[PDB]
Design a protein around this ligand. Sequence first.
Ligand SMILES: C=C(C)[C@H]1CN[C@H](C(=O)O)[C@H]1CC(=O)O
Ligand SMILES: C=C(C)[C@H]1CN[C@H](C(=O)O)[C@H]1CC(=O)O
Lengths: 257, 257
Amino acid sequence: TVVVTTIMESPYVMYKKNHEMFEGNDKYEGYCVDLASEIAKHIGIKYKIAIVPDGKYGARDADTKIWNGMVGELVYGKAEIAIAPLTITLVREEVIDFSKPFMSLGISIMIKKGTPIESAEDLAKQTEIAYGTVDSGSTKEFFRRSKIAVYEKMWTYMRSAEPSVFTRTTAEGVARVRKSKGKFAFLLESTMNEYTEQRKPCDTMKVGGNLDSKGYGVATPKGSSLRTPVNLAVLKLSEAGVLDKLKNKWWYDKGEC
Amino acid sequence: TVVVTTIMESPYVMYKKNHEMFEGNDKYEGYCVDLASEIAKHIGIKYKIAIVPDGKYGARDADTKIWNGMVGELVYGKAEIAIAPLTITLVREEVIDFSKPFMSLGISIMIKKGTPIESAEDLAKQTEIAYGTVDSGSTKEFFRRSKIAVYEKMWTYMRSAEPSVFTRTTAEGVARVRKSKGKFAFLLESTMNEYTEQRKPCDTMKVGGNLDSKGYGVATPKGSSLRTPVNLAVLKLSEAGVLDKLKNKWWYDKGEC
Ligand SMILES: C=C(C)[C@H]1CN[C@H](C(=O)O)[C@H]1CC(=O)O
Ligand SMILES: C=C(C)[C@H]1CN[C@H](C(=O)O)[C@H]1CC(=O)O
């Protein structure tokens, strides 16, 4: 049996109605739950879903040099494969292997319906509408690292802002948009943005184009025998239409708006 | 010095005004010419551009089992790295290594302005407007392999059509759209589509959404020491904004419409 690490994040992995009545993998449903099933079928493995104990994706602490989250579990040999909306980034690729993207995306702007913002350039040129990102992930690092004037102006604002503009989770950020009467805008990945837009009470929307271009990859530890099988499986699922089918299913078929 | 294989395809690789006056790499300009420069800088190599002798991308002949085009050059050790709009596909990944995508795309519909087509579903339900793809590449194989009713109807039509609906090149297909008074539609990758839309005489446009989702990757031969350097370089260029800069430059800054 192969340990598959993942994280609670809608609609990728979620708890079924009364998971208690269910056992093991049957407790969870979602996009990555479906993805895991399909990949495991393709590569012919038995697998077990283990939610990353610390509820994190993967960063390396600057002082201690330890890797946390799902990346951590791979690096320290606690799991064999990570199947989650885990953004393909250089620092991560330096320590683990990513398959080709199973999903393509870019950073995007979530507003509450009615907010006079259509673009990053709209956000930067004002201070009346607060804006931020989820804390400690790839979006914040895009802004931290950016050398593009507009995003640099956005990073300086976000980093100095009191109260903090950074959220623990996507859901927190979404909650703050909905609850802030148009005074908070949220910078998150287009995939969660598009998802939320189709969720009651339908008071949110995506605005403007994406600030960048990247994808999510299935991750394994360096030297893993499961590397090539996993990668050829993503390409197979992609080409067979199965990835598109799964996005349509969890985003739009289950959509509420 | 490293042999870099590539192919003539606008705006990726093209001949400069009077390349004769120029020498070696200085003869060519374009997106992949720029890409090669940047990657070579990042990984610290000397390199030489060699246009793939057979003017092909990479397929394996069913009888002889030989690989042609740019993939071929890698497999048979004629070049060390392929930098071109080479679509990441399973069969190719089985024989060579692809870096992460430097460009994201999907199959798209090119029409002559005025053509009453907005979608694949519009194309399939009629026969008055002919439609086809470039021959012997990943787009045709998407249609050949597809199990989705609409695309299967499209493949059966395309394969049976007389005269042939398949073109030697992108440019041929583009020429046939422009020249056919709205009686031919062209199925090509969104990247070339978007490019052509910005090219005089501006009589073409992209219509509807993409039929699929994939990317272009820098390719190296299996076991190459240049694998990880190349891959970390694409991620670096991506994250530094350089890929976006290069697309904007060759598509839109040089745009004519
Ligand atoms: C949900 C979170 C915190 C994750 C998921 N993907 C990104 C990552 O892998 O870092 C993060 C999103 C972001 O940073 O906006
Ligand atoms: C220009 C051509 C013939 C190439 C380029 N990328 C695809 C490939 O790598 O196969 C092909 C496009 C296509 O098939 O529509």
